[PDB]
Amino acid sequence: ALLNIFDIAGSALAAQSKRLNVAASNLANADSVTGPDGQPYRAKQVVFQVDAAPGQATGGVKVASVIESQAPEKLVYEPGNPLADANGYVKMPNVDVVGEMVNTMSASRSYQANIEVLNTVKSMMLKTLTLGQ
Amino acid sequence: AIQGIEGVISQLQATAMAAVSFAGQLHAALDRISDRQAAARVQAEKFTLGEPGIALNDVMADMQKASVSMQMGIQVRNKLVAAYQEVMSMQV
Amino acid sequence: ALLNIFDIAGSALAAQSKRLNVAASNLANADSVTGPDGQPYRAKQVVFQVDAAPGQATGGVKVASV
C-alpha cells in the first residue's frame, strides 16, 4: 500500500502551503490599518487536523478552518489619522513578526521534507514495477 | 438499422423468455490510464494558463501519479507480450 | 498570473516602497513655503488596505490613494 503515501504527502504539501500563505499574508499586513470593510486587519491562522475519516487509523493532515488569532489589538495613539477611535486609539493588527518568520521557515522545511518523501516513494514504486524483470 | 431494431426487439423477447471479458478489462485499464493522464495534462495546462484556484502542489502530484500509472501499464504490456510469446512457442 | 505567495509578497514590497517614497517626499519638503502654485505643502499619508481577494483569509496589501 505505497500508493496511499501519494495522498498523505500531497495533503501534507497542500496544508503546509496554505499555512505558509496565511503566515505571509499576516506578515505583509503587519502595518495595515484598514480592511475592505473598514475593520482593522485581524491576524489569522490555520488549524491542522488529522485527515482521517471515522475508522481510519492514520492519515495525512488537513486544514480545518482559518481562525482569527487571539491577541490584544495593538493600540496606537494617532488622533490625527482619519481612522481613529473615540479617544484616538487606532487599532493595528496583532501580528507577532518573529512568530510569522519562524512559521514561514517551519512551513518551508516541512514542505521540503514531504517532497523528499514523495520522491523516494516514487522511486520505490518504479522499482517494485521492476520486480521480476 | 430497421433490421437492427428488429434484432434488438428480438433480443428483448429472448430476455423475456429466459426470465466483462479479458479484452474488455484491458480496454478498461487503458481507458482509465489515458483518462488519468489527460486529467493531469489538462490541470497542468490550466495552471500554465494562469486560471485561479489551481495549485502547483496538485499539478505536480497528479503528474507524478500519471507517470506511475503509465509505468504500470508499460510493465503489464511487457509481461503480457512475454506470456504470449511463451505460449506461441508451445509445441503442438 | 503570479503565484499567490509571489503576488502577496510583491504587493508588500510595492506598498512599502510607496510608503518610503511618501516619507522621503515629506522629508524633502519639510521647509517648503509654497508649492507648485502658491499653496503650502501638505504632508502626505499612505493608507494600507488588505486586498479583499476571493480567499479573504489570504491577501496582500494595496494602497487606495495618498
Binding site: 496554505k18 | 484556484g53 | 480567499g55
Partner: peptide, 13 residues
Amino acid sequence: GGVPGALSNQPAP
C-alpha cells in the same frame, strides 16, 4: 476551499 494555497494563481486576478 475558503483559503487558496500559497502556490496557487492570483485568487485576485
